[PDB]
Each structure stands twice: as C-alpha cells, then as structure tokens.
Structure 1
Amino acid sequence: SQVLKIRRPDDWHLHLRDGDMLKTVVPYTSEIYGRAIVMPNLAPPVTTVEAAVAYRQRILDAVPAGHDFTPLMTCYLTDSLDPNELERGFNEGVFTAAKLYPANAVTNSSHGVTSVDAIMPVLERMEKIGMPLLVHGEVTHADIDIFDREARFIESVMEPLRQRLTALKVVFEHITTKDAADYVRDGNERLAATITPQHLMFNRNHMLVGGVRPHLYCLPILKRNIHQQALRELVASGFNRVFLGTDSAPHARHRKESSCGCAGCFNAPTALGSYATVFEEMNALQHFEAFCSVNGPQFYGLPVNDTFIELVREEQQVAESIALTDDTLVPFLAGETVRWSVK
C-alpha cells in the first residue's frame, strides 16, 4: 500500500472548546499536528491576555504524554477590547493572531463587534505591529440569503478593509465560494486563506438531498457544486497562500441532532486523510505537503516542522462515535471507509 510522508502538519483553524470536551478532543489534534491556531470563541470569549494564558495551560494539561503539540492562541475581537491589551498579548507571544467574527449591531460589546468601522483603532494597531487578522468573512444581516453572505462580505467589508489598511495581513478563514477563491487567488502576499476538508469533499446537495444531515451543517454554509469545484481547483493549483485549517468544531450528538442543530463538523480525527483523498483525486499530490505543512508557516513567519508523519493508502473504518463524559461526539465521516489514514 502506498505511503505519503510529509513534514508534520499544523492546523491553522481549530476549535478545542474547554472543560471535559477539551480533554476529549485535544488528543485528536495533538497526536498529528505540531501547532494549531486555537480559536477564541469560548463562553465567555478569550478577550484578554490572562484568559489566553490560562486557556493555553488547560490545553497543555490535556495533551497526552509525548505529543509535541503547541497551541497558538488568539484574541476574540470585540468593540470594548483595548488595543493596548491586544498589543501586549502579541508582544508577549500569547496572541499569535486575532479573530474577527461577523459584525452585529446588537452584540454585547464584551462579546463581539457591532461594525468593523467601530473597531478601527484595534485594526490599525494590528496593522502597525504586524499581527495577522483572521476573518470569518460573512455579513449576517437578516435580509441577506445565507448562501450569499460570504460573497457579500468580500464587497462590503474585505475589500474596503484591505484598501483602508494596506499593510494588514489577513487570513480569509474557511473559504467556501468561487468568489473567495478568485479573490484570494488574485490578492497580494498579505492575503491568504484556509479551507476545511468538508468544503472540498462536499457541496450543499450532500447536506440536503435524501435527508437533512446536521453533521454536514457548518458555517459558512456548504455551497453549490460550482463553488466546491473552485475550492478544489484552487488547492490543486499549487497556489501557495492557501493552507490547512480544519475548522474542527465539535458539538455533542444531542446538540447536533436536535430541533435546532449547532453548526460545526468534528473533523480533527479524519481531516488529514480527507485532504490527501482530495489532492489525489485532483492529481495534485505534489502540492499536498505544502498545503499541510509549509504554506501556513510561511504566511505566519514561523518555522516549518522538522519531524515527519506518514499517511498510508490502506482502507480503515471511521468510528461511529466518540464518547464524552456525557453524550457522544460523531466524527466527520463517521462509520465510513476512508482511503488514507495516518500510519
């Protein structure tokens, strides 16, 4: 059976949650990835240096003995965040980046951003100091169709922001459209993107035809096939400012399979082999290592890992579920036979 050896990868977009759930999910990441960008959308969010320090330690506490894993912390951008607090966290190595979630005029100032214009002092500071901005690029106005929200963000927010702050480094997280693929392809060295395995492997038909499948329900929402194909083409092209970001985003089974299912795929356990499957199908395995292990480091100005891992092209069954203290997690591709697994 065929082997693919790559420099140890990193995950440039990860949700690890907290408490018991954190304890359950960390190992799926730490066994494989050297570093991950740990997102700050805890309840309450990580908006201070002290919280990020404490959260980093809880994550390290949960890493199994012998895994060489380093969490890269982020600050949740809010209206009330002091730019001095963000700067101090960056300067002390606590915050690797800051994350901007969709604006909403009714958000509490302690929990989010009302408008992008309103946090310009903090954004100017990030530009000044060279701190990268990670963007969940959707506009969430009630009158905008959910499938249009990413495209609308490019026009309304992304392009004006980058024109306003010409030195700002930005990762367009988990892109899902041809709109975003083209935009990123056509950008400068200060614009990059991450892509999840689900947005490469599936489109909205997989989530809605024959049944509604809440384990494929995630934001930004799966788009039509033309968008899926654009994403696949982009990673297959060798374009070097797209990189691995799983957006592994675990929710208990009962919170997924409910009257109002939570958004997010728990894909940490199966992401890497899923990406290998996509690059192989695209006859583009020569660009697979760079996607997983080189492009992200280069954009963040961090070293490439100097250890290796091996994927083997031998069929394996994915677990149907993974136990939590209470309830269970259903992994991405649960119960399926997958083509590539880690040796």
Structure 2
Amino acid sequence: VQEIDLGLTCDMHVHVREGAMCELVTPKIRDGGVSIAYIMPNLQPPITTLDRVIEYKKTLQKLAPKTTFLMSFYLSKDLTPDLIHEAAQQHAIRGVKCYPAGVTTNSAAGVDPNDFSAFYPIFKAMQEENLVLNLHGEKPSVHDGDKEPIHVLNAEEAFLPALKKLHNDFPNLKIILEHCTSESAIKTIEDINKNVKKATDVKVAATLTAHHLFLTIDDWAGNPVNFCKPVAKLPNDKKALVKAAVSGKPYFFFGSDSAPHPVQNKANYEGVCAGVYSQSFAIPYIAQVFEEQNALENLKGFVSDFGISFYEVKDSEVASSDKAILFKKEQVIPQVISDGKDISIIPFKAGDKLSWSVRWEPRL
C-alpha cells in the first residue's frame, strides 16, 4: 500500500552539530520525516553542564520549532551525581551517552570501558531519576600480542560482556545498545529480553540505524562516505540486523546516527572522520527496507511506537502534533547537501533512487 500514516516518528540517535553546520541539519529532522529526536552530546567541549544543554536546546528550538527535542549529557570525568539530579528535575536532559576513549569522532574525552567503577556513582543517580543510558558499544583497539586482539570487527562483540554487567548491577536502569552492527549483539538483546513482552518491560533495548541495514564491509572499504563506527560488518551480521529491524519486537527501534561531516573530512588519505549522513531522508531510507521484506506493517512500530514506549514520550512534551505521512512518490537523492556558502555533505546513497517520500499532516 501507499500513503502510510506513521504518526509521531522517533529517531533516538541524532548528531546535528554546533554552528552553521547545525543550522543546515536541524531543519532536516523535519524534512527527513522525524518529529521526535534525541540529540547526542559529543561536541567541543563535550556537553557536561546544565547551562550548555539548556542553551543547546534553546538554539535547536529556534532552528526547528515544530521538532520535539530530547537532550543528553556526555559521560565524562566532569559529571557529578548532584548534577544528574539537578538536571533531571529541571527536565533539561533525557539521558546519558557513553563514548569509549578513542573509538569515534570527538570521543577522545571519553571513558575507559575496562573500569566502569569510577562511573558507578553516576549510574546510580540515573536509576533514581529514571534516565536513559546510551552505550556506544566498542572496546578500544588492542594489539598487545598477549591478550585477545581487539579490532573494529570484534569491538562490538567484546563489549557485550560489559553490557551484561551494567544491566546486572543496575536492573532498573534503562540502557540502550545504540547502533547494533553484528549478529552476536542481536542475540544478546534477544537473550536479555528473554520473556518480556508488550511494550514497557524492556529495560535494555537497542537502536538500529538506516545505513547498517544496507551496508556491508565491501561498501565502505573503498568508500569513506559509508565509513562509520561501529563499522558495517559481514553479510551474516547484516542478515540479523534486517530481521531484527522488521521483527516488530519492542526492544528494537530506530536510531539513525546521522553524523554529518564536511566533504573535505571524508576526502582524506588518513584520519578519515567516521559517520554517515542520512538525516535528510531518514524515514524514506527505512521505508525501502520495510518494503523489500514486505513488512510495511511493522514500520509504525520500529520507527514510531517503540521509540515512544521506551523513552515514555508524553503528549505534553511534543512540540508540534503533526503526523508523518509516507507517500510513494519516487525521488532522487542529490549528489550533495549544501548550505550555500561553505558546507557540503554527501548524503547516504548519494544519487540512488527511493520508492518513498514523506510529508506532514496535522492532528485534527
């Protein structure tokens, strides 16, 4: 069928930017089909204060008034358990995002996942205030010639033990294994969620991006535009990610990980910035996967329903109650997304065609 009403769409993994790069991307949340988003904190400096996250939401509300924004804090060595509480009652944040040290862009100020003990007073504060824990699951690279060599392939699988220890020590804490990329990570989410069903018994969930449903290792090997973290893994891994996405289970929903960089950052011969931009056509990308699997009925759950049930998004928090209408008009993906002065992005599947577009329609 065409003209599917998805309602209030949820993209609970969003990197927009600061600056003029932010003025170009923040409207594209509306134009990508997303109504409710989740802004990540990895900036320069990292968002670790109450004043910064309030003015960062103050700016995004001006650039996109109709978009509903949920902010986050950077898990760093400057956070305090009293800051977590003071930011919670003020309703200035919606969760915390953890970056391992030196695994992605702006993650140098991150943490060491081998010893999470220093950040247990912080996680105890989130469990009381009912916040969300975002986990970029990837152990740092270890050659070492002695212990299990960690690389970009087995980085997510090696993080799974740390995920089960964080779930065991904080059973009530809502934790998300963002951007699952392997099959071992999927079976772990299937394992922790043994017999939980309906919508809200899920305490540990996982978000699946738009590019990880398409990309394999053969794609970004010579194409730095597709290179992101965690890297796209084998087809056997992509097989599980597609099945888990069209699964219709409540512990899987949509987090795009749209990380826009200028094209001069990708066109490097080393030190290429990882990230894939898919914000301008966020929902259209997912509609093509759900049509290939003939599972267009689960598109409402994965994109809209499950992201609202986990974060418990309320009707009073929504900025503009406009529903997303997914109509089937073919569109071409431009070769470049430019702001007109100096910024240039290469969107995901730049040049390819899509089966779907998306407009907006108000609740009457």
Band of TM-score, shorter chain: over 0.9
2:337 corresponds to: 322
The change in CA–CA distance for 1:267 and 1:110 in structure 2 (over 3 A counts) is closer
Contact 1:270 1:333 in 2 (8 A): no
Q: Residue 49 in 1 paired to residue 50 in 2?
A: yes
**Aligned-partner Cα distance in 2 for 1:57–1:190:** 30
User: Could you tell me which of 200, 212, 220 is aligned with 1:207?
Assistant: 220
Contact 2:4 2:327 in 1 (8 A): yes
**Aligned-partner Cα distance in 1 for 2:273–2:47:** 21
Larger RCO (alpha carbons 8 Å, 6+ apart) = 2
Q: How does 1:253-264 map to 2 (within 5 A)?
A: 253-259=263-269, 260-264=271-275
**Aligned-partner Cα distance in 2 for 1:3–1:44:** 43
Contact 1:249 1:264 in 2 (8 A): yes
Contact 2:259 2:276 in 1 (8 A): yes
1:111 deviates by: 3.0
* 2:76 counterpart letter in structure 1: T
In the superposition, the TM-score normalised over structure 1's length comes to 0.92
Q: Residue 35 in 1 paired to residue 36 in 2?
A: yes
Q: Residue 86 in 1 paired to residue 84 in 2?
A: yes
Contact 1:79 1:109 in 2 (8 A): no
Contact 2:101 2:107 in 1 (8 A): no
1:17 corresponds to: 17
Contact 1:36 1:72 in 2 (8 A): yes
Q: Residue 150 in 1 paired to residue 156 in 2?
A: yes
**Aligned-partner Cα distance in 1 for 2:108–2:51:** 15
Q: How does 1:1-343 map to 2 (within 5 A)?
A: 2-31=2-31, 32-63=33-64, 68-103=66-101, 111-114=109-112, 115-143=115-143, 144-155=150-161, 157-188=162-193, 189-208=202-221, 212-259=222-269, 260-303=271-314, 307-324=322-339, 325-343=341-359
Moved more, 26-35 or 306-315: 306-315
1:90 deviates by: 1.5
Name whichever structure is richer in helix by fraction: 1
The count of aligned residue pairs is 334
Q: Which runs of 5+ in 2 are unaligned?
A: 144-149, 194-201, 360-364
Contact 1:319 1:331 in 2 (8 A): yes
Report the 3-state secondary structure (helix = DSSP H, G, I; strand = E; otherwise coil) of the residue aligned with 1:186: helix
* 2:88 counterpart letter in structure 1: F
**Aligned-partner Cα distance in 1 for 2:351–2:165:** 44
The change in CA–CA distance for 1:166 and 1:103 in structure 2 (over 3 A counts) is farther
Contact 2:99 2:136 in 1 (8 A): yes
**Aligned-partner Cα distance in 2 for 1:8–1:161:** 31
Give deviations 1:50-71, integer Å, cap 9, x for gaps: 11011111212222xxx52121
* 1:206 counterpart letter in structure 2: D
Moved more, 261-270 or 186-195: 186-195
Give deviations 1:98-120, integer Å, cap 9, x for gaps: 1111146xxx9993323322111
Report the 3-state secondary structure (helix = DSSP H, G, I; strand = E; otherwise coil) of the residue aligned with 1:280: helix
**Aligned-partner Cα distance in 1 for 2:268–2:141:** 25
Q: Which runs of 5+ in 1 are unaligned?
A: none
Contact 1:78 1:110 in 2 (8 A): no
**Aligned-partner Cα distance in 2 for 1:36–1:167:** 23
Report the 3-state secondary structure (helix = DSSP H, G, I; strand = E; otherwise coil) of the residue aligned with 2:297: helix
Contact 1:185 1:239 in 2 (8 A): no
1:129 deviates by: 2.1
The change in CA–CA distance for 1:251 and 1:89 in structure 2 (over 3 A counts) is same
Give deviations 1:186-237, integer Å, cap 9, x for gaps: 22320111111110112111222xxx10111000000000010101111122
Give deviations 1:31-87, integer Å, cap 9, x for gaps: 432221000000111001111011111212222xxx521211100011231111122
Report the 3-state secondary structure (helix = DSSP H, G, I; strand = E; otherwise coil) of the residue aligned with 1:55: helix
* Same amino acid, percent of matched pairs: 31
In the superposition, the TM-score normalised over structure 2's length comes to 0.87
Moved more, 187-196 or 17-26: 187-196
Contact 1:80 1:110 in 2 (8 A): no
